[PDB]
Design an enzyme around this catalytic site. Structure first.
Site, mmCIF file in Angstrom:
data_model
loop_
_atom_site.group_PDB
_atom_site.id
_atom_site.type_symbol
_atom_site.label_atom_id
_atom_site.label_comp_id
_atom_site.label_asym_id
_atom_site.label_seq_id
_atom_site.Cartn_x
_atom_site.Cartn_y
_atom_site.Cartn_z
ATOM 1 C CB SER A 1 4.147 -14.869 -32.360
ATOM 2 O OG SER A 1 4.195 -14.699 -31.253
ATOM 3 N N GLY B 1 6.131 -19.198 -35.422
ATOM 4 C CA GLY B 1 7.272 -18.066 -34.844
ATOM 5 C C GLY B 1 7.318 -18.381 -33.423
ATOM 6 C CB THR B 2 9.510 -16.833 -30.870
ATOM 7 O OG1 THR B 2 9.063 -15.665 -30.397
ATOM 8 C CG2 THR B 2 10.689 -16.826 -31.702
ATOM 9 C CB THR B 3 5.871 -18.658 -27.271
ATOM 10 O OG1 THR B 3 6.190 -19.956 -27.744
ATOM 11 C CG2 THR B 3 4.450 -18.482 -26.657
#
Lengths: 244, 111, 231, 250, 240, 241, 195, 243, 235
Positions: free
Chosen positions: H74, H29-31
């Site tokens: 995340s 996932g994104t940070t």
């Protein structure tokens, strides 16, 4: 989920057989043989104990023969513990009937209900069936003396004489060969013991490896008596028919 | 003891012409000898050309009208925007009222 | 492969194949396009018949007077989700006398779809939805995927070959965003966008379905001769 | 969530064996030896207290448990299974007997109740069988002294004398040689200690051996006086000291 | 409770558990029904690997549901008791609420529904049983014969057989039953029924049961001799 | 081979999921130790904070279950906290129902029974932890009772748990062989803590600063953990010896 | 409802039961049969709360008919009366109890004896030579005490019944519109059609 | 083997592979990050702008619990929402019974026990998110991070998602370089930079920055989003330091 | 095995697709909609000459304005019919009016996906629901176990269906009369049927606004069969 670990106890084989019933029957075929013989004046129950040890307390014991009510008893072949579950159910069923109708329960009705319970375990609930076959010996004022057997499938049938457990094939042939309809109780007693003597997997038949019972009207007038034989009484009846 | 009912007064009146109908009611709302409001309307447009009033105990009257309007909404949702005929509205209201047979809406309803 | 037996199983790379397979049913579904300005939001849907003897499966469902959606994938699942939405819109009105925010509608769907992805025995929803609405902060367009992911957009499309329409809208963005106070021009841009996804078939009169909602316009559906204007 | 295992985990194989009962018995097989001998005026049950570490206090681990004032239990197999069975056995003696008849169950019936619990774990949904065999020794007015064995299947048998677990085969042979129907309680205790020394490898003393009797009533262990008909528990655990006394005269 | 879907579709569109239930019916002892002008007759094979049977008390293969309707079956015996019990309870319930006994068609439709229900319910297997249900509707003299099977489908039959070798005896009834002329008497009807069982049974010793149902709750079982006479008579005319 | 996935017997009568839960017990690579004084019970456990981004004060495997009972856990933290919360609830309910504080050995038995249930019931997995309960019991005196994933439990004179448990155990065994008694014959708990840390060092062959350790002490009517500064004071006393 | 009587004579049980059905100030019906045949040799008359009487009667009837079919056997009068008593005894601690009093008259074919059972709504059962429910008994019990003999013929039983009905027609305040009479003997149940 | 096909099964090492597989979904996932400061906490997250069609500022990922707690996560977004809905229920019931708003350590365990509960049975799936959350209570500021296994600790700073190592290194610098403490307005800036620095590992797509904070002085102890001039100020400070 | 509710990797529900295979094995059922009525016809297909063919009941009344034909596992349809009848009668009780055909069909189709681990499997039968209402006139619907229903001008289901539908594609136009439609159903049934079509092994029915839904007697159909033989020898 949990599906992965499910045996599916209540399904058909492609041949249309209930796997678990079949395997439970296979289990029962290694159980000590039990024989019931019905005479004109009574019924004999005789059963062989699973290979007893010398230190086993034999007199205060109960493995094969059980009392359901005053008029009805059963011989057991299979898992004892399973059988006791079903026995107490049957005992309660007998008492409900007595309470409701103020009459002792007809032999078949009790047998049907107990068989219906077994049947349920083969059709629903995903549990293993009871690994038990019964011989029912009983009396009522409609059909008099009756023998029945039920097995894990929940199928029951009536008999003049029948065996369950080990070596039923050999046992049934021998009973079929010497049974007669007019036969008295004391002749049936002899037939029963002489059959077990020939079908046992033991070296010889002895009192300590046997349970024995009779249902006669040989008490006093129009009333029935159950006799579960003590160990000494079995030793006597064994000598009295010269098997020892 | 808690009494779940009250009487909010008022009166309503419906007359049917040949190609029209009127449903009228006063706008006064009372409890006992007090006026709660001189203008609190209790005749409502429920859509599909049906007008409704549930006079008596106002809280039950409002609950009923609210439920009926909501019935009209879902009748459209479930039956391809079909118009709710007045006879059908009537029967539907019977079931709303009788559904509370053992704890009734204290209202005289007219549509 | 070994890890696609049910939704409750993660693959070794962290994937949920049953959800991904649910996403696949959307891709087989007929294209539908959504887009909005600052005054209206529009849905255009390409309907799909079974053969020349059958009706064209409806793709647009009204949820409230100010909200509705279009569907791509399993229609019964859209019926369940649209029904749930109708109830939430209704509950908001009856209890709070408040029209349901399109944003809350989105949050509610996400959470409903999510529950079917974390428990044994269930299955994910096999449908994608495009929700349009006009609420207290203007015109809105949402995209619902049955993974639970809901996204607010100026425009998008889902279904088979939706990729054509999606790039067109990405190019047309600065034009259509400012079609404020003109109904038919927003619909025209939607019809132009959905055309980028057609193959070996053109928009007919019982093939095309359009919905518009906006400032002074209740969510309403156009069908049949009422869409002839736009072909 | 919750138990989605509503199906049996013990089922008949094509040969007719019930695998999990068999395997439970195999676990009982590995268990440390325990035994019971029935005298004419008492019963004795005994077992080895093999320790997990010398830092452990083995007094705090009771392998021989009082169930009723006239009934005691000992086992071979998995200790924690035994522990919960003792809890259930104590409770069931009250709930299905004492609370009904105002007296404690007779040995055979309490045994029957334990056996029932064990049978149900052999058939009910989502459980395995219990991995123990119990020996239960007791006394009641109308049956006198008795000794029962309860197996993972739920089967039970009465015994004059027997052993279970690790070295049972040898011990049973030993007991056959020395048992008779005229043994006085002290004789049986002495035979028990002799039998147990065969199966014990390490230290053999009052701290490594747990041993109890069902014998005479102990009014000194009652806790009160003034009701003639209450005379005290027949169950008594022999002290570490009492065992050693009999080990010199071995 | 136990939930598992045991009856499910296979990729060829078969429900194997329903089909495997039919296999159990196939193994069961033969059963046949033939309707006359004025009666229905139910015949059942009895396997003779069991001697020392007590036939006073052994469960009969034909069962009365009410005083005017009977049910026989092939397949698992224990399963059949459950259907018979339900049918009997429904029969009394019908009399109590409708103030009229069940029509044979209604009673059949009920038993069929129970069977069907067990083919799409979680945690249960289908009934390994097919039934023949026969009798006369209240105040009606036209005979009825129906057949149910594990799937839940049911239908009316001029005559029909189920169980082991039922294809052989259906063969016989298919060539020996005239739709234009049903067996005009009780005598004639019972003969055709016994004849068909003798294509499959053995010696018709303690091997054939017959039950004869007539209008207005007139039902009776035939005894060995009565049947024996048909057996003996059929064989003599046969040597030709 | 599904007899290895759930808690049913293998053909040789073993429960593999229980055995694998024991292996998860060492997953944290921490060692703990408990000993008894005259007036007190001391439990010490290694404290390892690998990441610089962690808040060191929140890294703990010792729990105050009740006013009188302390618990140290060997195993992963999520299971450890699950076990802690339950024991807190169990000890509080006990007090409410029976009108006196739950004894260490009884709480140990209760948690042991709960653990046994997971070894018999299929839908419940065993917790990958070993629970060492400590107190000064009003009837029994200073007490150590330990529970594992098999549902086993017993009281101890002293004990250790973790990857290097056997070294610590024999170290302690050797001392008591010598000392001739059941406990540390010491007056203050401060010196019993000092004994504990000393024998931890000999057994493990490593030196400790104040943030390498975690210490819990049970005395009559209270259980408390020591601060880094209390431990530093204790380490200083050991150095000057 | 109101009037139900029974007399067991030498070879049969006779049940007399009133014909009126009254609600308010109107006799709605003057030909009501307050009885149900439970089995070919067992008959049950009933009186009590409106609706409850018939519902109960028919429910018992269905149960006994079900037993008959299942077992292909007729339950003895004693057993039926015990079943009926148990149902009423359950009912009295129900949320809404059946308010029904019954008389069960049967011929036991095993014993070749007629049997009469009186059971009230509480589930109080007694076997009797003659029985009455309600205010009926206040007149008929004393009259029967005097004129009843155990060896009476069916014909003598019927004359004794006439005497009861005559006394009730003399001294009862309400018009019960005569009685329907039925005889239960070895050949089953039959109705006297002129009394 | 087959040990990794069912949740709650111990492997022979002693691991629950399904939880480890859940971690992979998180790592995918994104940070997102959290920075604990003098009297507060700051949360920020990278929002990949997939297309020009995403309405900017309108797909909000950070969530408030009660009035004083922020949570960001995340991995699987819907799983994170589910967890926060539970967090909200837990905080509501705590406040109902005890009156006081839920303390942050207390709140951390409510989520901890709930997530851990989803590793106890094969009939549920573990959570596919790591969650950074925290706020201010009567004992000051607290930052927490919670994994799919249910494991959680207190943090000085924390990060998760694709850019976790990058962010972690950047966070470790701050911890060394400011032992006396970082301020609220300071940490807002730093958070912006770190998300930009950690965006290198997700650099196909460009992103939208999102920040929130609770500070006892700057927001009165309540969770507020950073918008307008203060957001642009921190965006700019980050633009400086990448170039 | 694998969950009963599982998706395939192509995004279809296994159990639903397999029930569609069972419906293909069903006896043929055909419906044709016209401005004078909708006709429903079915292949009875008795498994033996002994089974009495009028007892085969694959055409069924739902209300006076709605009728139904089935194909596949016909035992599965009993409860679908029962729900349909209850829904229609209940609607009339609540609303004092006739229930719309589409609404009826939707109510039946709501049952269909209510299966899994609710009933244990999907239905193995497809229905042609045909009726009339005042809003949309004469309508024909095809209700599958997927929970989906399509309106059709004409439609065939069962084993003979792919052939029958191509046949229906050519023959159907918007101005068919009722008599034309009856003959057409008979013609197409005779083509796809295994056995030779007659008044015993096939059945007809229709629904008209005026007379509601009616199954035809064997006499009435026999005459339409004769009539059809005459029209086709005559060119």
């Amino acid at each position: 989920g949990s599906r992965r670990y499910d045996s599916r106890t209540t399904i058909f084989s492609p041949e249309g057989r209930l796997y678990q019933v079949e395997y439970a029957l296979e289990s029962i075929s290694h159980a000590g043989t039990a024989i019931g013989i019905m005479a004109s004046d009574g019924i004999v129950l005789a059963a062989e104990r699973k290979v007893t040890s010398t230190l086993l307390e034999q007199d205060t014991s109960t493995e094969k023969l059980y009392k359901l009510n005053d008029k009805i008893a059963v011989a057991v072949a299979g898992l004892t513990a399973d059988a006791e579950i079903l026995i107490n159910t049957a005992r309660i069923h007998a008492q409900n009937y007595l309470k409701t109708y103020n009459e002792d329960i007809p032999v078949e009705i009790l047998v049907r209900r107990l068989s219906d319970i077994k049947q349920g375990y083969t059709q629903h609930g995903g549990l293993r069936p009871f690994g038990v076959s019964f011989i029912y010996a009983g009396y009522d004022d409609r059909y008099g003396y009756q023998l029945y057997t039920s097995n894990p499938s929940g199928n029951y049938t009536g008999w003049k004489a029948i065996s369950v457990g080990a070596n039923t094939s050999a046992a049934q042939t021998l009973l079929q060969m010497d049974y007669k309809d007019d036969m008295k109780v004391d002749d049936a007693i002899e037939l029963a013991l002489k059959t077990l003597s020939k079908t046992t997997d033991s070296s010889a038949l002895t009192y300590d490896r046997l349970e024995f019972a009779t249902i006669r009207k040989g008490a006093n007038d129009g009333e029935v008596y159950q006799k579960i034989f003590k160990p000494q009484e079995i030793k006597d009846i064994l000598v009295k028919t010269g098997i020892t | 003891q808690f009494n779940p009912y009250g009487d909010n007064g008022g009166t309503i009146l419906g007359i049917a012409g040949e190609d029209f109908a009127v449903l009228a009611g006063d706008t006064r709302n009372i409890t006992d000898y007090s006026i709660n409001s001189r203008y609190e309307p209790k005749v409502f447009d429920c859509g599909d050309n049906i007008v409704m009033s549930a006079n008596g105990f106002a809280a039950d009257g409002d609950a009923l009208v609210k439920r009926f309007k909501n019935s009209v909404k879902w009748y459209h949702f479930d039956h391809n925007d079909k118009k709710l005929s007045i006879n059908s509205a009537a029967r539907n209201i019977q079931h709303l009222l009788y559904g509370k047979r053992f704890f009734p809406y204290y209202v005289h309803t007219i549509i | 492969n070994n890890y696609d037996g049910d939704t409750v199983t993660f693959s070794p790379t962290g994937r949920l194949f049953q959800v991904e397979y649910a996403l696949e049913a959307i891709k087989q579904g007929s294209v539908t396009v959504g887009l909005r300005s600052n005054t209206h939001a529009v849905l255009v849907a390409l309907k799909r018949n079974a053969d020349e003897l059958s009706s064209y499966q409806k793709k647009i469902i009204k949820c409230d007077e100010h909200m509705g959606l279009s569907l791509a994938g399993l229609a019964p699942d859209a019926r369940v989700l649209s029904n749930y939405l109708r109830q939430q819109c209704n509950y908001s009105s009856l209890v709070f006398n408040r029209k349901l925010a399109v944003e809350r509608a989105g949050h509610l769907l996400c959470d409903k779809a999510q529950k079917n992805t974390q428990s044994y025995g269930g299955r994910p929803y096999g449908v994608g939805l495009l929700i349009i609405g006009y609420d207290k902060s203007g015109a809105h367009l949402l995209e619902f995927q049955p993974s639970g992911n809901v996204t607010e957009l100026y425009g998008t499309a889902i279904g088979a070959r939706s990729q054509g329409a999606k790039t067109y809208l990405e190019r047309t963005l600065d034009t259509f965003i400012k079609i404020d106070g003109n109904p038919d021009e927003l619909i025209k841009a939607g019809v132009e966008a959905i055309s980028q996804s057609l193959r070996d078939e053109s928009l007919t009169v019982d093939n095309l379905s359009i919905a518009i909602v906006g400032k002074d316009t209740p969510f309403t559906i156009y069908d049949g001769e009422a869409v002839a204007k736009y072909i | 969530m919750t138990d989605r295992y509503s199906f049996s985990l013990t089922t008949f194989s094509p040969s007719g064996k019930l695998g999990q009962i068999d395997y439970a018995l195999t676990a009982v097989k590995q268990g440390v030896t325990s035994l019971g001998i029935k005298a004419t005026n008492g019963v004795v049950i005994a077992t080895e207290k093999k320790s997990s570490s010398p830092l452990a206090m083995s007094e705090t681990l009771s392998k021989v448990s009082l169930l009723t004032p006239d009934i005691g239990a000992v086992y071979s197999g998995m200790g924690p299974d035994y522990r919960v069975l003792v809890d259930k056995s104590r409770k069931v003696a009250h709930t299905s007997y004492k609370r009904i008849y105002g007296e404690y169950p007779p040995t055979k019936l309490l045994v029957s109740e334990v056996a029932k619990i064990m049978q149900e774990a052999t058939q009910s949904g989502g459980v395995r069988p219990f991995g123990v065999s119990l020996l239960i020794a007791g006394h009641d007015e109308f049956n006198g002294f008795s000794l029962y064995q309860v197996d993972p299947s739920g089967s039970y048998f009465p015994w004059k004398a027997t052993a279970i677990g690790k070295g049972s085969v040898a011990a049973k042979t030993f007991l056959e040689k020395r048992w008779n129907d005229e043994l006085e309680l002290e004789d049986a205790i002495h035979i028990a200690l002799l039998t147990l020394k065969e199966s014990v490898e390490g230290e053999f003393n009052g701290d490594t051996i747990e041993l109890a009797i069902i014998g005479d009533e102990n009014p000194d262990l009652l806790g009160y006086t003034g009701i003639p008909t209450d005379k005290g528990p027949r169950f008594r655990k022999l002290t570490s000291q009492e065992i050693n006394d009999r080990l010199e005269a071995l | 409770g136990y939930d598992r879907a045991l009856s499910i579709f296979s990729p060829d569109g078969h429900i194997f558990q329903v089909e495997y239930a039919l296999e159990a019916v196939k193994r069961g002892t033969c059963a046949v029904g033939v309707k006359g002008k004025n009666c229905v007759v139910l015949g059942c094979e009895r396997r003779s690997t069991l001697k020392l049977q007590d036939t006073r008390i052994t469960p009969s293969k034909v069962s009365k549901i009410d005083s005017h309707v009977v049910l026989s079956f092939s397949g698992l015996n224990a399963d059949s008791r459950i259907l018979i019990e339900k049918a009997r309870v429904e029969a009394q319930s019908h009399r109590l609420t409708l103030e009229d006994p069940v029509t044979v068609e209604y009673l059949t439709r009920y038993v069929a529904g129970v069977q069907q229900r067990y083919t799409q319910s979680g945690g249960v297997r289908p009934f390994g049983v097919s039934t023949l249900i026969a009798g006369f509707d209240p105040r009606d003299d036209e005979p009825k014969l129906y057949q149910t099977e594990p799937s839940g489908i049911y239908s009316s039959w001029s005559a029909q057989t189920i169980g082991r070798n039922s294809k052989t005896v259906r063969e016989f009834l298919e060539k020996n039953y005239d739709r234009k002329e049903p067996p005009a008497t009780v005598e004639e009807c019972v003969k055709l029924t016994v004849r068909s069982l003798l294509e499959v049974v053995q010696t018709g010793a303690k091997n054939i049961e017959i039950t004869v149902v007539k209008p207005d709750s007139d039902i009776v079982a035939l005894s060995s001799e009565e049947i024996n006479q048909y057996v003996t008579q059929i064989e003599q005319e046969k040597q030709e | 081979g599904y007899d290895r996935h759930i808690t049913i017997f293998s053909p040789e009568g073993r429960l593999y999921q229980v055995e694998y839960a024991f292996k998860a017990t060492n997953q944290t690579n921490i060692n703990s130790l408990a000993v008894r004084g005259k007036d007190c019970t001391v439990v010490i456990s290694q404290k390892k904070v690998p990441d610089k981004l962690l808040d060191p004060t929140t890294v703990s495997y010792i729990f105050c279950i009740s006013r009188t009972i302390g618990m140290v856990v060997n195993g992963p933290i999520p299971d450890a906290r699950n076990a802690a919360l339950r024991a807190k609830a169990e000890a509080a309910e006990f007090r409410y129902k029976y009108g006196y504080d739950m004894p260490c050995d009884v709480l140990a038995k209760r948690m042991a029974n709960l653990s046994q249930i997971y070894t018999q019931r299929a839908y419940m997995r065993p917790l990958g932890v070993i629970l060492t309960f400590v107190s000064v019991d009003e009837e029994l005196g200073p007490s150590i009772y330990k529970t594992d994933p098999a549902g086993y439990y017993v009281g101890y004179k002293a004990t250790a748990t973790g990857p290097k448990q056997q070294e610590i155990t024999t170290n302690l065994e050797n001392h008591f062989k010598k000392s001739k008694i059941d406990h540390i014959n010491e007056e203050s708990w401060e010196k019993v803590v000092e004994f504990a840390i000393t024998h931890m060092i000999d057994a493990l062959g490593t030196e400790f600063s104040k943030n390498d350790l975690e210490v819990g002490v049970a005395t009559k009517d209270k259980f408390f953990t020591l601060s880094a500064e209390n431990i530093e004071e204790r380490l200083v006393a050991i150095a000057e010896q | 409802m109101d009037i139900i009587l029974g007399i067991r004579v030498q070879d049969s049980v006779i049940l007399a039961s009133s014909k009126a059905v009254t609600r308010g100030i109107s006799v709605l019906k003057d030909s009501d049969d307050k009885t149900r045949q439970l089995s070919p040799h067992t008959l049950m008359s009933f009186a009590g709360e409106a609706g409850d009487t018939v519902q109960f009667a028919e429910y018992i009837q269905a149960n006994i008919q079900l037993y008959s079919i299942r077992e292909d056997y007729e339950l003895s009068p004693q057993a039926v009366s015990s079943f009926v008593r148990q149902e009423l005894a359950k009912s009295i601690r129900s949320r809404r109890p059946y308010q029904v009093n019954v008389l069960i008259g049967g011929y036991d074919k095993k014993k070749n004896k007629p049997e009469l059972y009186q059971i009230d709504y509480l589930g109080t059962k007694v076997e009797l030579p003659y029985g009455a429910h309600g205010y009926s008994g206040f007149y008929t019990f004393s009259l029967l005490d005097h004129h009843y003999r155990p060896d009476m013929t069916t014909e003598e039983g019927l004359d004794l019944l006439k005497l009861c009905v005559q006394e009730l027609e003399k001294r009862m305040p309400m018009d019960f519109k005569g009685v329907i009479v039925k005889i239960v003997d070895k050949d089953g149940i039959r109705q006297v059609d002129d009394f | 083997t087959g040990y990794d096909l069912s949740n709650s099964v111990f492997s022979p090492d002693g691991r629950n592979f399904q939880v480890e597989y859940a971690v992979k979904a998180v790592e995918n996932g994104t940070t997102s990050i959290g920075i604990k400061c003098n009297d507060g906490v700051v949360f920020a997250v990278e929002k990949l702008i997939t297309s020009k069609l995403l309405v900017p500022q309108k797909n909000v990922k950070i969530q408030v619990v009660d009035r004083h707690i922020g949570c960001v996560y995340s991995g699987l977004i819907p799983d994170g929402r589910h967890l926060v809905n539970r967090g909200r229920e837990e905080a509501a019931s705590f406040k109902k019974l005890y009156k006081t708003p839920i303390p942050i350590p207390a709140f951390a365990d409510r989520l901890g026990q709930y997530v851990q509960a989803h590793t106890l049975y094969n009939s549920v799936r573990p959570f596919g998110v790591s969650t950074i959350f925290g706020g201010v209570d009567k004992n000051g500021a607290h930052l927490y991070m919670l994994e799919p296994s249910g494991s959680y600790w207190g943090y000085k700073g924390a990060a998760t998602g694709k850019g976790r190592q990058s962010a972690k290194a950047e966070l470790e610098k701050l911890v060394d370089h400011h032992p006396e403490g970082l301020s609220a307005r300071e940490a807002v800036k730093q958070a912006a930079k770190i998300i930009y620095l950690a965006h290198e590992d997700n650099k196909e797509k460009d992103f939208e920055l999102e920040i929130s904070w609770c500070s006892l002085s700057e927001t009165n102890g309540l969770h507020k989003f950073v918008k307008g001039d203060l957001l642009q100020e921190a965006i700019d400070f980050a633009q400086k330091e990448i170039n | 095995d694998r969950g009963v509710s599982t998706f395939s990797p192509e995004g279809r529900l296994f159990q639903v697709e397999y029930s569609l295979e069972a419906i293909k094995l069903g006896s043929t059922a055909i419906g044709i909609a016209t401005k004078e009525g909708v006709v429903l016809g079915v292949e009875k297909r008795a498994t033996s000459p002994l089974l009495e063919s009028d007892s085969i009941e694959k055409i069924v009344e739902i209300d006076r304005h709605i009728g139904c034909a089935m194909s596949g596992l016909t035992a599965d349809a009993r409860s679908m019919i029962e729900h349909a009848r209850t829904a229609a009668v209940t609607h009339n009780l609540y609303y004092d009016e006739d229930i719309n055909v589409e609404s009826l069909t939707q109510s039946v189709c709501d049952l269909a996906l209510r299966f899994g681990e609710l009933m244990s499997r999907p239905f193995g039968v497809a229905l042609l629901i045909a009726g009339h209402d005042a809003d949309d006139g004469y309508q024909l619907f095809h209700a599958e176990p997927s929970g989906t229903f399509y309106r059709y001008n004409a439609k065939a289901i069962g084993s003979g269906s792919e052939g029958a539908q191509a046949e229906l594609l050519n023959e159907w136009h918007s101005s068919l009369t009722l008599k034309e439609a009856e003959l057409l159903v008979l013609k197409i049934l005779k083509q796809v049927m295994e056995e030779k079509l007659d008044e015993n092994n096939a059945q007809l029915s229709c629904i008209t606004k005026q007379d509601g839904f009616k199954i035809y007697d064997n006499e009435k159909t026999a005459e339409l069969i004769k009539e059809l033989k005459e029209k086709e020898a005559a060119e």
